[PDB]
Enzyme design. Structure first.
Site, PDB file in Angstrom:
ATOM      1  N   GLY A  49       0.853  -1.164   0.000  1.00 41.32           N
ATOM      2  CA  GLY A  49       0.000   0.000   0.000  1.00 41.32           C
ATOM      3  C   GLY A  49       0.887   1.210   0.000  1.00 41.32           C
ATOM      4  O   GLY A  49       2.089   1.096   0.190  1.00 41.32           O
ATOM      5  N   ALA A  50       0.309   2.374  -0.226  1.00 44.49           N
ATOM      6  CA  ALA A  50       1.112   3.575  -0.269  1.00 44.49           C
ATOM      7  C   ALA A  50       1.842   3.812   1.043  1.00 44.49           C
ATOM      8  O   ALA A  50       3.003   4.196   1.036  1.00 44.49           O
ATOM      9  CB  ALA A  50       0.241   4.769  -0.609  1.00 44.49           C
ATOM     10  N   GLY A  52       1.936   1.371   3.764  1.00 42.80           N
ATOM     11  CA  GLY A  52       2.303   0.171   4.494  1.00 42.80           C
ATOM     12  C   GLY A  52       2.300  -1.125   3.718  1.00 42.80           C
ATOM     13  O   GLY A  52       1.812  -1.177   2.605  1.00 42.80           O
ATOM     14  N   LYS A  74       2.980  -6.869   9.806  1.00 46.19           N
ATOM     15  CA  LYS A  74       2.468  -5.581   9.378  1.00 46.19           C
ATOM     16  C   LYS A  74       3.465  -4.499   9.695  1.00 46.19           C
ATOM     17  O   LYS A  74       3.954  -4.414  10.807  1.00 46.19           O
ATOM     18  CB  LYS A  74       1.179  -5.249  10.118  1.00 46.19           C
ATOM     19  CG  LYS A  74      -0.024  -6.100   9.773  1.00 46.19           C
ATOM     20  CD  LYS A  74      -1.246  -5.509  10.443  1.00 46.19           C
ATOM     21  CE  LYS A  74      -2.465  -6.380  10.272  1.00 46.19           C
ATOM     22  NZ  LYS A  74      -3.507  -5.984  11.249  1.00 46.19           N
ATOM     23  N   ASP A 183     -16.672  -1.878   8.440  1.00 46.06           N
ATOM     24  CA  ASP A 183     -16.276  -2.134   7.065  1.00 46.06           C
ATOM     25  C   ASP A 183     -16.188  -3.642   6.852  1.00 46.06           C
ATOM     26  O   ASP A 183     -15.196  -4.163   6.347  1.00 46.06           O
ATOM     27  CB  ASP A 183     -14.957  -1.432   6.748  1.00 46.06           C
ATOM     28  CG  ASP A 183     -14.529  -1.585   5.302  1.00 46.06           C
ATOM     29  OD1 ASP A 183     -13.312  -1.488   5.048  1.00 46.06           O
ATOM     30  OD2 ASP A 183     -15.400  -1.799   4.422  1.00 46.06           O
ATOM     31  N   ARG A 187     -13.696  -8.819   1.306  1.00 50.23           N
ATOM     32  CA  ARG A 187     -12.322  -8.401   1.096  1.00 50.23           C
ATOM     33  C   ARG A 187     -11.559  -8.380   2.415  1.00 50.23           C
ATOM     34  O   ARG A 187     -10.345  -8.511   2.441  1.00 50.23           O
ATOM     35  CB  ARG A 187     -12.272  -7.034   0.431  1.00 50.23           C
ATOM     36  CG  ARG A 187     -13.045  -5.959   1.159  1.00 50.23           C
ATOM     37  CD  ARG A 187     -13.026  -4.652   0.392  1.00 50.23           C
ATOM     38  NE  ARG A 187     -13.840  -3.632   1.036  1.00 50.23           N
ATOM     39  CZ  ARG A 187     -15.146  -3.514   0.867  1.00 50.23           C
ATOM     40  NH1 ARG A 187     -15.781  -4.357   0.083  1.00 50.23           N
ATOM     41  NH2 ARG A 187     -15.820  -2.569   1.488  1.00 50.23           N
ATOM     42  N   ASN A 188     -12.291  -8.187   3.503  1.00 49.81           N
ATOM     43  CA  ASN A 188     -11.730  -8.110   4.848  1.00 49.81           C
ATOM     44  C   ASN A 188     -11.745  -9.413   5.635  1.00 49.81           C
ATOM     45  O   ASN A 188     -11.498  -9.422   6.827  1.00 49.81           O
ATOM     46  CB  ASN A 188     -12.412  -7.008   5.643  1.00 49.81           C
ATOM     47  CG  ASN A 188     -12.139  -5.638   5.081  1.00 49.81           C
ATOM     48  OD1 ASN A 188     -11.109  -5.410   4.471  1.00 49.81           O
ATOM     49  ND2 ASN A 188     -13.061  -4.723   5.285  1.00 49.81           N
ATOM     50  N   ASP A 201      -9.233  -6.225   8.501  1.00 50.54           N
ATOM     51  CA  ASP A 201      -9.648  -4.904   8.030  1.00 50.54           C
ATOM     52  C   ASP A 201      -8.951  -4.533   6.723  1.00 50.54           C
ATOM     53  O   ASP A 201      -8.033  -5.214   6.312  1.00 50.54           O
ATOM     54  CB  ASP A 201      -9.423  -3.837   9.096  1.00 50.54           C
ATOM     55  CG  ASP A 201      -7.970  -3.541   9.332  1.00 50.54           C
ATOM     56  OD1 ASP A 201      -7.653  -2.405   9.712  1.00 50.54           O
ATOM     57  OD2 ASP A 201      -7.140  -4.435   9.137  1.00 50.54           O
TER      58      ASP A 201
END
Ligand SMILES: CC1(COc2ccc3c(c2)ncn3-c2ccc3cccc(N4CCC(N)CC4)c3n2)COC1
Ligand SMILES: [Cl-]
Ligand SMILES: [Cl-]
Ligand SMILES: [Cl-]
Ligand SMILES: [Cl-]
Ligand SMILES: [Cl-]
Ligand SMILES: [Cl-]
Ligand SMILES: [Cl-]
Length: 338
Positions: A49-50, A52, A74, A183, A187-188, A201
């Site tokens: 991700g941008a 992380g 993470k 949310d 996808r989560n 998440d």
């Protein structure tokens, strides 16, 4: 540039108007979680991700039960802001607060001293649910032991019911802790070895800005297709709203990874239809009973929607009795780890 925070509710006013949510910074980190950096080896990048990334890793000595352990780590990118580091710390505090459950991705350990902050989480072999469903779309044809194991065979209705049951259980656990996901979506949800559902998440590992699922409003991005009407209009978020999300999620599961409200873009027209009381038609692989669960979840009145606990009960009846027994043994094995 953003992630959607899980909210834990500290208190609610007698009127039902003022909600106080716990402050993560206020909560205390537990040092027991700390794991030596040398004891962690980093592998291939699971996601980027941008701000992380999530990386495959092996943790040595982290667990007595699994001395050599496959895990996911993470971490923030150098691009990450000073404020964002806070977010990672906040995640640690909230996760420790909630405790562990079989159906949510769990915190195993963290490296927070003299190094870039690292969060160690359970490793899920199958990845996100949406991708897994798409991969197994073909070869899907409309015993219980096979379901809670790694044996590979064509995906079945039984498998879908299992995923349906596990998400309900994971959600039931979150609700019990007064924790609102905000949310909840396929996808989560990630699938671990043994076809064990784990709830997660969106995170900073992937870009919310580059995801079609989210509409940006103000300073925030919203998964409108998965939001209860009160959340969309009244900006109210609760366990009940999550239930609405659960029904949308079930639709995703029974459509084999399908996009909710297919052919419909989120626009003023979409908002009007929801207010009108519009609901999705039955998915192709959904049984009448499963669709019924989705419809109940979509009730306009939140109090009218079923509790996650009730949902677990309903789903269980739609599963062979041996499935429940298997879940119980796995649940106990999970709590016995270490
Ligand atoms: C070898 C394979 C391995 O894949 C994977 C992917 C993610 C895996 C994984 C194995 N174990 C864990 N996680 C995690 C863990 C926490 C996450 C917390 C937030 C967001 C995540 N994600 C999910 C995947 C998405 N593409 C990036 C962001 C997370 N993922 C490829 O699937 C099998
Ligand atoms: Cl979170
Ligand atoms: Cl390996
Ligand atoms: Cl469909
Ligand atoms: Cl049917
Ligand atoms: Cl109920
Ligand atoms: Cl609930
Ligand atoms: Cl239960």
């Amino acid at each position: 540039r953003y992630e959607i925070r899980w909210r834990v509710i500290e208190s609610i006013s007698p009127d039902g108007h003022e909600y106080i949510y716990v402050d993560p910074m206020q909560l205390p980190y537990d040092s027991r979680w700390e794991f030596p950096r040398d004891g962690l080896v980093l592998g291939r990048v699971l996601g980027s991700g941008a701000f992380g990334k999530v990386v495959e890793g092996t943790a040595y000595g982290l667990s007595r039960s699994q001395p050599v352990m496959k895990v996911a780590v993470k971490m923030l990118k150098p691009t990450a802001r000073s404020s964002e580091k806070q977010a990672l710390m906040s995640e640690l505090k909230i996760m420790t607060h909630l405790g562990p459950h079989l159906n949510i991705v769990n915190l195993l350990g963290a490296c927070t001293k003299s190094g870039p902050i690292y969060i160690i989480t359970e490793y899920c072999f199958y990845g996100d649910l949406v991708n897994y469903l798409h991969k197994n779309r073909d070869s899907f044809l409309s015993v219980k032991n096979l379901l809670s194991d790694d044996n590979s065979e064509g995906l079945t209705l039984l498998d879908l019911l299992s995923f349906t049951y596990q998400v309900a259980r994971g959600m039931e656990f979150l609700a019990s802790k007064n924790c609102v996901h905000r949310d909840l979506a396929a996808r989560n949800v990630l699938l671990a070895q043994g076809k064990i559902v784990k709830i997660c998440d969106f995170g900073l590992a992937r870009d919310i800005m580059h995801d079609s699922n989210y509409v940006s409003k103000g300073s925030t991005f919203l998964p409108v297709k998965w939001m209860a009407p009160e959340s969309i209009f009244d900006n109210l978020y609760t366990t009940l709203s999550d239930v609405w999300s659960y029904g949308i999620l079930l639709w995703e599961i029974f459509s084999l990874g399908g996009t909710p409200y297919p052919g419909m873009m989120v626009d003023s027209t979409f908002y009007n239809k929801i207010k009108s009381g519009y609901r999705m038609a039955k998915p192709d692989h959904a049984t009448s009973e499963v669709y019924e669960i989705m419809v109940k979840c979509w009730n306009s009145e939140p109090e009218k929607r079923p509790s996650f606990y009730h949902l677990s009960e309903i789903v269980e009846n739609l599963l062979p009795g041996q499935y429940k027994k298997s879940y119980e043994k796995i649940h106990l094995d999970f709590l016995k780890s270490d």
